[PDB]
Amino acid sequence: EMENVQKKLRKLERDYYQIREQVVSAKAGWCAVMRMVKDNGVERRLHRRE
Amino acid sequence: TIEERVKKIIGEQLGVKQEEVTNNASFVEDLGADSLDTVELVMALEEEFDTEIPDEEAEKITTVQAAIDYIN
Amino acid sequence: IQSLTARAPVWLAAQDTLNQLCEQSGETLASSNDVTEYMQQLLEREREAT
Amino acid sequence: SHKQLATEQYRHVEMARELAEQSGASSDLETDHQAASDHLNLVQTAMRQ
């Protein structure tokens, strides 16, 4: 039973790996957008924090 | 050298350039990266080196230099 | 947490309007009484300019 | 779950080790009990003679 949970751990590990690539790739673009947005839009116009 | 990874990734994760980061400063407050941004930075470091860093060790990277200290 | 979450959006909308309003003026407001006294100064400027 | 599984495997190995010792003891006891059954039959035989 526990060896199947180990193999479950492996499957979960590759799922985690996928999620991790998603996160890093997303931040790479967030960087660029928040670079360009600093032409006073982000101050309060686009950042409708409500 | 291999540190070019870290000193590259850091910038790519924080918007600063390679030379902007100073070893004396701290990510949490002296780089502008908040809790989420620092989590993203440490987790990107984890991804790049194909390794793992538990929570306890991961929390000890608040300073710029630490990013290499645990690596090398 | 549920109470705070229900309360949050209203407070945030109110804060955005307040920041816009006081930034539109030269003076920065901090309390209800402060807003009232600013009302009075506004009236005095009305009745001089007129 | 990874560390739990690692710890549970270490515990599992320890319980498996003690049962290996009892399994050996059971084979030794089977050997002693075979001799014991023979001893009973030898005594029954001696009583008849």
Swiss-Prot record, chain B:
It is found in: Cytoplasm. Pathway: Lipid metabolism; fatty acid biosynthesis. 4'-phosphopantetheine is transferred from CoA to a specific serine of apo-ACP by AcpS. This modification is essential for activity because fatty acids are bound in thioester linkage to the sulfhydryl of the prosthetic group. It comes from the Bacteria. One of its GO terms (cellular component) is membrane. Keywords: Cytoplasm, Fatty acid biosynthesis, Fatty acid metabolism, Lipid biosynthesis, Lipid metabolism, Phosphopantetheine, Phosphoprotein. Its main location: cytoplasm. It holds the Pfam family PP-binding. NCBIfam families: acyl_carrier (TIGR00517), PRK00982.1-2 (NF002148), PRK00982.1-3 (NF002149), PRK00982.1-4 (NF002150), PRK00982.1-5 (NF002151). Carrier of the growing fatty acid chain in fatty acid biosynthesis. Interacts with MukB. This is Acyl carrier protein. The lineage of its organism: Bacteria, Pseudomonadati, Pseudomonadota, Gammaproteobacteria, Enterobacterales.
